[PDB]
């Protein structure tokens, strides 16, 4: 059953969980972690890389990476997601 997603955070050695509605496009999402990461308030980032089904982790900066993933968390079975900060 379809409801909400999780991103897990992936830093150079931090490691955050946020929860992003299926319904936060490609920019309330951006925003989402980049509010989440406003801790710092002193760089975010504009560029995320999630895991993919295969295994193999892909750019995401729009809705098309953002959907054309989500409609494979159905697909991996996962109601979370993996998302890379460098």
């Given at each position: 059953?379809?409801?909400?997603?999780?991103?897990?955070?992936?830093?150079?050695?931090?490691?955050?969980?946020?929860?992003?509605?299926?319904?936060?496009?490609?920019?309330?999402?951006?925003?989402?972690?980049?509010?989440?990461?406003?801790?710092?308030?002193?760089?975010?980032?504009?560029?995320?890389?999630?895991?993919?089904?295969?295994?193999?982790?892909?750019?995401?900066?729009?809705?098309?990476?953002?959907?054309?993933?989500?409609?494979?968390?159905?697909?991996?079975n996962?109601?979370?997601?993996?998302?890379?900060?460098?």
């Open positions: 059953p379809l409801g909400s997603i999780l991103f897990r955070i992936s830093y150079n050695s931090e490691i955050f969980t946020l929860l992003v509605e299926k319904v936060w496009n490609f920019d309330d999402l951006i925003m989402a972690i980049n509010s989440k990461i406003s801790n710092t308030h002193i760089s975010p980032i504009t560029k995320i890389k999630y895991q993919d089904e295969d295994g193999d982790f892909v750019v995401l900066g729009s809705d098309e990476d953002w959907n054309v993933a989500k409609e494979m968390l159905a697909e991996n996962e109601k979370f997601l993996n998302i890379r900060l460098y």
